[PDB]
């Protein structure tokens, strides 16, 4: 009954911040639906190496936006605790609705 978005760049922080928030409520009230990983939005833009000109031999960079999703069913009141109160963001976006 509660939809949560964890939009970060690295996954080694989402597949650890999500799976952390999961059983931090699973065991404290109604069950939950695992972390559903949705498609990534990337920025595969390229750029020409040399400063001056050399429209060939370039180098491109991409900016990956990894998205994690977890939905706790029955919105316990024993959950607006270790969750709504215990936050562990270090460089991650979190947006929750219902």
């Amino acid at each position: 009954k509660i939809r949560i978005k964890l939009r970060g760049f690295d996954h080694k922080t989402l597949d650890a911040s999500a799976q952390k928030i999961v059983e931090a409520a699973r065991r404290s009230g109604a069950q939950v639906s695992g972390p559903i990983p949705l498609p990534t939005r990337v920025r595969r833009f390229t750029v020409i190496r040399g400063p001056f000109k050399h429209k060939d031999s370039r180098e491109h960079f991409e900016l990956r936006t990894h998205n994690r999703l977890v939905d706790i069913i029955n919105p316990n009141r024993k959950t607006i605790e270790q969750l709504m109160t215990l936050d562990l963001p270090t460089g991650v976006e979190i947006e929750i609705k219902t």
Binding site: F9, D10, T90, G91, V92, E93
Partner: protein, 206 residues
Amino acid sequence: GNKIHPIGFRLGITRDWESRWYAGKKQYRHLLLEDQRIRGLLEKELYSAGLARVDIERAADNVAVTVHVAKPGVVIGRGGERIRVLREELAKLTGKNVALNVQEVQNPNLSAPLVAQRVAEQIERRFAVRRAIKQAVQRVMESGAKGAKVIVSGRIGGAEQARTEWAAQGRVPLHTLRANIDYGFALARTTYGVLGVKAYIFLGEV
């Protein structure tokens, strides 16, 4: 005219972002700038202790500013005034949570970014640019390290025609990802021109 940046090369593993946080396609810009000017003023009023890195985190209107150093006793002063006067400056351009760490280095001669600046100085100090390398390496190597390497650019000594002074020891495989090598670069402007300081420190593995 080649060779990628060992740093940007390992950007996904064996070395991590010197600034990790999230930003939407709506502010990443302003914030990216912010992080920049921060490093700017910092690299200004903080050379006496000569840093070697400036990590920065976020998650909700906060700032790490975890300034790793090799002489923190200076960034602070005599108790906690310098470190206190600075937190002051930083917040002056950002109405944010201007935190500020002050790590250190158990051995700065195992952190290129520093070794670089050292020689940079020596050059501007009019030192034997050759031995100044022989030593800047015989140091890091003497103090344990699977690899050293310092490269200086043109104007070596002031001779009209520019030359590149090389010299290294140990092992330095810029082609092996899992090798965590420390790349250190810093300028050394003189009366006759500019010089280049490149240092390679080989550390970890597997």
